[PDB]
Each structure stands twice: as structure tokens, then as C-alpha cells.
Design a protein around this ligand. Sequence first.
Ligand SMILES: *C/C=C(C)/C=C/C=C(C)/C=C/C1=C(C)CCCC1(C)C
Length: 137
Amino acid sequence: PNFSGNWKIIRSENFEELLKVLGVNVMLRKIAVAAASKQAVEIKQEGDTFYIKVSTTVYTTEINFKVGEEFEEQTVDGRPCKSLVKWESENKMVCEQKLLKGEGPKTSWTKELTNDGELIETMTADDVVCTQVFVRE
Ligand SMILES: *C/C=C(C)/C=C/C=C(C)/C=C/C1=C(C)CCCC1(C)C
């Protein structure tokens, strides 16, 4: 597949429940939910190497990885982690994260290209899954 593109969010579900698992207090969860509704994802894919820029109104982050090679990033709530991305099918990748220090909930994310041209990203903390849907600009 080709994940490359400038993606804009059209749907964001269960994001508050995810942040609750992660210990975020109520008012910051609501503010974070409003932020998530302005999420944009810019992807440059070259083979199995990915350059991804995730951004809101006031913040932007870069995630660069090669499939199958360990790398460092942060959980959704900012804790540093070790990450490894594997394919699960032609069009979907899965990333498992392990905290660098301390412990916390089990976190992971997935990214998938649908046949309808949608990008579906999920983020998981233990039992709770946030699902986010994007379309190309
Ligand atoms: C392949 C796509 C990935 C790994 C995207 C992950 C998305 C995030 C880490 C999103 C984070 C946030 C917002 C969209 C808004 C509020 C602040 C965050 C960190 C919860």
C-alpha cells in the first residue's frame, strides 16, 4: 500500500476513555478531546520506512521508524517508550510499546489503509481502544 499523504481527521471516538485509563484528570481530558478533533497526520512512506508528522493546533510531533526495527517514542500521554512496528496484513501495521521506566497500562497503536481510501488509526491502553479516521486533503 501507500500510506503517503496529508491526512485530516473526520472522526475521533473513545479518546476520553483512553486518557482516563492513563490518569488524565477530567478537565484536561475534555481539552485534549477538543485538540484531537484538529489532528492532522502527514505521512511519507518509502518501502517499509515511514516518516510521520502528527500535529494539532499548537503542537507537532515526528515519528520516524522502519518496520521491524526498534525505536523510541512516547505513549499518548507522554511517557518515553520503546516501540516496534510489524505488519498484520497488506494494509495494516501494529506497534507494540514498552515503557522505558516505571510501569503503567499496556499501550499500542495501529494504522490501516482501507479500500475506501480512509486512514484508520487506533490507540490502545489495556482494554480501551481509541479509533480515529482520516481522509486525504
Ligand atoms: C500512525 C499514527 C500515529 C502513531 C498517531 C498517533 C496520534 C497521537 C499520539 C495523538 C495525540 C494527541 C492528539 C491528537 C491531541 C491531544 C494530545 C494527544 C497526544 C493526545
